[PDB]
Structure formats: structure tokens, C-alpha cells
Design a protein around this nucleic acid. Structure first.
Lengths: 137, 117, 94, 79, 58
RNA sequence: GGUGACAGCAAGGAGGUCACACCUGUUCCCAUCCGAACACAGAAGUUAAGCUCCUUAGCGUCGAUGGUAUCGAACUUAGUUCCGCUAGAGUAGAACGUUGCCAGGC
RNA sequence: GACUGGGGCGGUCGCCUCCUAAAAGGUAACGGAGGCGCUCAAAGGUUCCCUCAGAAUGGUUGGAAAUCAUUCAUAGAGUGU
RNA sequence: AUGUGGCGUUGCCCAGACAACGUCGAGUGACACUGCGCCGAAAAUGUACCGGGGCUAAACAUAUUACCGAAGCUGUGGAUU
RNA sequence: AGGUAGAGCACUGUUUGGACGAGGGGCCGGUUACCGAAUUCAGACAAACUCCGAAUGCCAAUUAAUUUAACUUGGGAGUC
């Protein structure tokens, strides 16, 4: 249910999905994360479900740092109506993720426990995942 | 935080010196006093070369009696070098100051002398 | 700590570079005091064996061509996907 | 069926550079169209009440640099 | 210091800029030739349309 | 000291009636609730401050070398290859002004 | 009357500014945003001068702050629309 | 998903590590960036995509060469400009 | 001449975690945590943010090479 308090414009263009993660793609606030390998539009509902999966799994022992926010709004149009009467009304908020971006990040748990907790939420979420650790070397 | 005057002078000069300059047919002379003495130095700013100079600290005019007669004589004495060359149209740059008192006396002496300002 | 390192021959293209960067090597540089510009390629599994015990800040005695120079790890690029080093940067402090 | 609130705009003005650096111009020629002072006048150059830059003699135009970022245009006489 | 350029491809399907470069070299139809002095002005026009022509140092 | 061509901000250090400032003023032309400003009349004492001499790069300013892409061309309908032009970060490094024409005094 | 993702219903129709617009200019849709159909004998001319909202500092009633001095204070002030 | 493919380090090491409640001998078991597979995938006249026959190469690849292939170009003769 | 790609947050807006005490407040005026705004170390995002910016495309000038067009004024159209 995360969304901006108020946004300057309401009917904004549809972002890009070609290229690679512009930034934000190293785990630097926890100890174990999970990051994307294809591009997609991860939305408010499926972020919601994926955090549901992990707080419902760790039983509030650890925590999750959500490194993604739905800054842009998209619209839709009345149910299968004719073309050409202005743009439609808002329907949800999204965040484009490119190959590389750290999606979810957990900390303070067994490396095993993360290794399956981040496996669970991968299914709720429309981008193929990969599990990573804190960087060394 | 008390401030000093000559920085404001330099600002005034830079700020209203924007449209005025010499062209070696229309030279300009400026003026400068601090507290006890008077300078003046004419220049043609295309070349930035000095032509004439007149000062109240100079030896040949070294008097104390009044602060107005020194302006008068320094004026009427730059007029000597002027009526030797370049004594037609010139501009009187007022430095950064008002037009009151010593500057007026200097301009009067430089004026009723053989010059064209 | 005697990292065996070859020199990059003049004018590597982007194709030539990216195809040498598949056999396993990695481009590099040294600079600083008593030294000039050079383009070099360094081995990787050797480099990681070196910097898994020497510390991120530390000494190196790699041999570059004909004499040896004591250098320290300064900079890196390290693309994240299919983890492999892209660029490693050395400064001949002397 | 529906009501579109938008649909407005104005006619585009043809602002910007009108003559080229290095090109011989004529007296009273318009060198740059602009709202404002994106480029300042220079030597033998004027500005009109629309902020329009123009030449005052027959010469050659050069675009140059005024201070640290401000820019200016001049005309130099001999062709 | 002498080149021998031959038009081994057709101009059909190409942009107008490339076709104008081909005309300035002096080449008219497919497989036609021209003998010119080597010169950076000639070589820029060779480089623009290099996928269209063959060159040989005579 | 004056004007005149392309580096700063400050921070400890010192040094002098040749500079110019700090001051004495309401007395006069000037001049505003206030000579706090602006004027003009002093010139007693004076580098404490401004000025002024390296300076600290600490802040700031420039700026490499490596090289991380987008015209052209094929291959293909999923971004891969060969080219040419190479950024923004960012490292090293420089950097506490080069100094144009006169007075005075050398 | 016309336009119109058939027509009708509905909305709109002139001018100004910005995105779309692909670093010259130009460029469409019932694409996305706002304005106008004036005002000022000074808010015009010309000679001078003159230069911060906010904060911090304190200050006789303090609607906390307006009124009062000091440290700032990059112009963030401000400019009739 | 234990389908298989290397480069890999490795914990336990033939002092006898995984089993059978001491026999037992050759590696054990783990942790990944990658190759081909895996199921994955369920409409109506009649086989039905090599177009057909057929093919384990006549498939897909790489590296050389040969040849065939247009009203393109060259030979030979002609026309009109 | 110029602000697109890319990048970058220094300005306008969005941002998540992590931050500091004066104070309304706990009370019997106060403690203190706690509510809110502010500044604060800490880091992702933009068609209508930018200062740091391409490749190309544009204008021009030329004792810088190959090429054969270009313009002005008239007769005749078709095309929407």
C-alpha cells in the first residue's frame, strides 16, 4: 500500500525497459539480499505480497529493507471502450527494475533461512531472481 | 562589522564605468582623493596607456593653506599639458564620487582653462 | 607477492579487449612517482588468491616487464552480473 | 460522447541564431532572435525592445565569451 | 598513390546521402570504374560508402 | 600608490606616520531619529584592525592516463558483432595567481 | 454549421506559455498542463543614491512571529498579470 | 526436479570418512557463475509443413576451397537520341 | 550556434532506512519517553529537475579534391 503522498503530475509517460540497472545495485544496508536478472514493472500489489511472504515466514525475527519504490503512476481506460477521448484515470504505481537492481534485502538471520525465505518471494514476483551475499574481494 | 569606503568606490566605478571610455579623439580624465591629497590620471582605454598626470602631492605645488586652491591649481596645471596636445573634446570621469565640493572646483579649473568638457 | 603481469600491446580495440577478457585476464594500469603510462593485463585467479589474505589496502610487488614496482590496490570496476573483474588500477607510489 | 479539457497551444516563434559565425553580414542585420538575453550585444551590435540582437556596420560576425559563462556576439569591420 | 575504384553493389535501397557520395566519385553503374589520385578528400568519400565499392592501388 | 591583460574563501605568523587606513571632531560647503551614514575641517598618536609578506591546500579551483557507450555496417526480432567519435563519475596530479602602461621611490 | 476512431448526445472553435519535439528551425492526435479578451499619469522617462525571505540572537502587551537591534542570510528576496 | 556438461575449491581423508546391525576400501560430499535437455503446452472436412519424396546427415555448426544461379555486368550485330 | 542520449543529484518535487536536543508533554512547576515540525549523518528516482554533456544532424567561410548542377523570370499542368 506504498505510494507517494502527492505527485506533481498525474498522467505520466511509460518508462523505459531497455538497458541495465542505472544504480542502486549493491547490498549495503543488510547482510543478505536478492536482485533481478530481467526487466519488468514490479507494482504495488506484488511488492506487497512478496513482503507478506517474508514477514509471514521469519515470524518477525529479522527485517526486510525494501530498496524499491513505486514512484510512477500508470492509468487504464473504462472497460473496453472506444478509442480517442483523452487519457484514462490512474490505476496503480510501479517501479521499473532492470537487470542488476537489488530488489529485496534482509538482515540478521541464518544464511540458510534467508536462502529459502528469498526463494519463497521469488514466485510472487514477475522477475527471475538470484541470491547474493555481502560483497568481499 | 564596520565597512570601508574604497571598496564601494571601486564598485561604483566598475558599475557606472560601463558605458564611458576614451577613443584618442575623446579622451577621459578621472579623479581620486582619499583624505589629504588629490590624484588625476588621463588614459585612452583602447590602448590602456597613460598620457598626462596631475597631483597635489607634487613638489612644484606644495601648499597647505586651503584644500580648495590645491584642486584649483592641479586642474589649471593639467590644462597646461593639455593645451600642448589633446585639448579638444574630453570626458570628465568622476571616479566613484558625487559632484560636490573639491571635485566641482577641480572640474571648474579644468574647464575654464582651454578644454572641451 | 610477485604478480606476473604482461603488457597490453598498442591500441587494443573494444572488440580485441572484450575478447581477451574472456580467456580470463583483466586490464590494468600503474601510475604515479618515477613512472609513466603503460597498458597492461594481469591474471585474475592469481590476483584473487593474492587479495584474499593481503587486505584491500596492502603491498604488491608485481613485475611489469623488466623491473619490479611496489604498488597498492587503489581502484576497480567489477561489473555485478556474471561476476568478473573489469578493471584494476595500481599507482606506483614509490 | 466525452469532453476533452485540453487542446490549447500557441504559435511557435522562430527564435535562435539567424546568421552564422564567420559570415559577412550587412548593416542592420538580425543575428539572433530571443526572449531575454541568452546572448549579449557586443562590438557594433545592438539590442531591440524584443531582446533582438542586430548589427550596426557591414562586417563579419563572431560569437564569443563575455565573462565566465555569459556569452556575447560582435561584428568586426574589415571584411 | 593511385587507386582504382569499382562499384560492386547497386545503389537501389540506399539513402540519398550515400547515393550522392557515389555520384561524386564518378561511378555510374554497377561494376564501373574510375582512376583517381590518392587524396584525403578522395579517401573520405571512399570511407563513407565503403560497403559499396572495391579499391585497388594502381 | 594609479589605471589597466588573462587566480578564491578563511586560517596561525609577523613586520611601519614614505603609502593608505584607524582615529580628533560639529566648527564651516555637505548632512540624515542619530556627523550611526554622507560632508568638510583637523593631523595629535598609530600597523591593534583594513591594507599589507610567504603562507596552511584544511575548504575551494582546475585536471590527466586507463576506458565504462552512440553514427555507419552486417546478423537478426533479440539483443548479439565489426567499426569510428568518446562521456559523468571517478582515481593520480597540479594548485594559496601570469602578470599589460605610468607617479613616487629604487 | 462544422469537427468527430460510424452518427447522435457531449465537448470544443480566436490569441499567449510549457512538454510531447528525436541538442538549429518546423512538426500530429477528442495527447498532457495553465493563462487572455487587461492594467499603470505612474508600475513611464532621466539624474542620483540604495540592497534579503527565512533562521539564530535577544526585546515594555509579545495571537509564537508584525513593531525593536546583532550574526548571518546568495539572492532562496523580488519583480502588477 | 538426483537429467546431465566442465573449470572449482573443498569438509570429512585409505589412522579406514557415507551404509549393515567390527565386516567394507577409493574418494568422499558439498557448495556455482555456464551446455545441451526436462516436463513444461490442452479443437472441430483429410495426412498436413522438407512444399513433396525422403534423410542420423541430405540436421546444426566452424574453416577452406569448387560449381550453379537475374532481363545485373561483359562478348557480337543493330536502332533512335 | 545548441541542452537530446547518457550521467548526476547542487535547484524544484518523490524517497527508504538510519538520526539529534530546546520545547508543548510524564507528574505530583518539572523528570521522560513520547506527538509534531526543524536542522541534521546517512542513499535511490523524473516528459514538463539539471551543470558537469555526446555521437550525429545545422549554418557558414574558404589559393583546402572529385563531381554537374543551381538560380531568376514566363507558358502548361496534375496532385490534396
Amino acid at each position: 500500500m506504498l505510494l507517494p503522498k502527492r505527485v506533481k503530475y498525474r498522467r505520466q509517460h511509460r518508462p523505459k525497459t531497455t538497458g541495465r540497472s542505472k544504480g542502486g545495485n549493491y547490498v549495503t544496508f543488510g547482510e543478505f539480499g536478492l536482485q533481478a536478472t530481467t526487466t519488468s514493472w514490479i507494482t504495488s500489489r506484488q511488492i506487497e505480497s512478496a513482503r507478506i511472504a517474508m514477514t509471514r515466514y521469519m515470524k518477525r525475527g529479522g527485517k526486510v529493507w525494501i530498496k524499491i519504490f513505486p514512484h510512477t503512476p500508470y492509468t487504464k481506460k473504462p472497460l473496453e471502450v472506444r478509442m480517442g477521448a483523452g487519457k484514462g484515470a490512474v490505476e496503480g504505481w510501479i517501479a521499473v527494475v532492470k537487470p542488476g537492481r537489488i530488489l529485496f534485502e534482509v538482515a540478521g538471520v541464518s544464511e540458510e533461512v534467508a536462502r529459502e525465505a528469498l526463494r519463497l518471494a521469488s514466485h510472487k514476483l514477475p522477475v527471475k531472481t538470484k541470491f547474493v551475499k555481502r560483497e568481499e574481494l | 562589522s564596520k565597512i570601508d569606503k574604497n571598496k564601494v568606490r571601486l564598485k561604483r566605478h566598475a558599475r557606472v564605468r560601463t558605458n564611458l571610455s576614451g577613443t584618442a579623439e575623446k579622451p577621459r580624465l578621472n579623479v581620486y582623493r582619499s583624505n589629504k591629497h588629490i590624484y588625476a590620471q588621463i588614459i585612452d582605454d583602447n590602448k590602456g596607456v597613460t598620457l598626462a598626470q596631475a597631483s597635489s602631492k607634487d613638489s612644484d605645488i606644495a601648499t597647505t593653506a586651503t584644500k580648495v586652491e590645491l584642486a584649483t591649481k592641479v586642474g589649471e596645471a593639467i590644462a597646461k599639458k593639455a593645451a600642448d596636445k589633446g585639448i579638444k573634446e574630453i570626458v570628465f570621469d568622476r571616479g566613484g564620487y558625487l559632484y560636490h565640493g573639491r571635485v566641482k572646483a577641480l572640474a571648474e579649473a579644468a574647464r575654464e582653462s582651454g578644454l572641451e568638457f | 607477492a610477485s604478480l606476473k603481469s604482461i603488457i597490453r600491446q598498442g591500441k587494443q580495440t573494444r572488440s580485441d579487449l572484450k575478447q581477451l577478457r574472456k580467456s580470463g585476464k583483466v586490464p590494468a594500469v600503474v601510475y604515479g612517482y618515477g613512472t609513466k603510462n603503460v597498458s597492461v593485463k594481469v591474471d585474475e585467479v592469481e590476483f584473487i588468491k593474492v587479495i584474499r589474505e593481503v587486505g584491500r589496502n596492502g603491498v604488491i610487488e608485481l613485475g611489469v616487464g623488466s623491473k619490479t614496482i611496489k604498488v597498492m590496490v587503489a581502484d576497480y570496476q567489477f561489473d555485478p552480473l556474471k561476476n568478473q573483474i573489469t578493471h584494476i588500477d595500481f599507482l606506483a607510489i614509490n | 460522447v466525452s469532453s476533452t479539457k485540453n487542446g490549447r497551444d500557441s504559435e511557435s516563434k522562430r527564435l535562435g541564431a539567424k546568421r552564422a559565425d564567420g559570415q559577412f553580414v550587412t548593416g542592420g542585420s538580425i543575428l539572433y532572435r530571443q526572449r531575454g538575453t541568452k546572448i549579449y550585444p557586443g562590438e557594433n551590435v545592438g539590442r531591440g525592445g524584443d531582446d533582438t540582437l542586430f548589427a550596426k556596420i557591414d562586417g563579419v560576425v563572431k560569437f564569443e565569451r563575455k565573462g565566465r559563462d555569459k556569452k556575447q556576439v560582435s561584428v568586426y569591420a574589415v571584411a | 598513390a593511385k587507386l582504382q575504384i569499382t562499384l560492386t553493389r547497386s545503389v537501389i535501397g540506399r539513402p540519398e546521402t550515400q547515393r550522392k557520395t557515389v555520384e561524386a566519385l564518378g561511378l555510374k553503374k554497377t561494376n564501373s570504374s574510375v582512376v583517381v589520385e590518392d587524396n584525403p578528400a578522395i579517401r573520405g568519400q571512399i570511407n563513407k560508402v565503403k560497403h559499396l565499392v572495391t579499391v585497388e592501388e594502381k
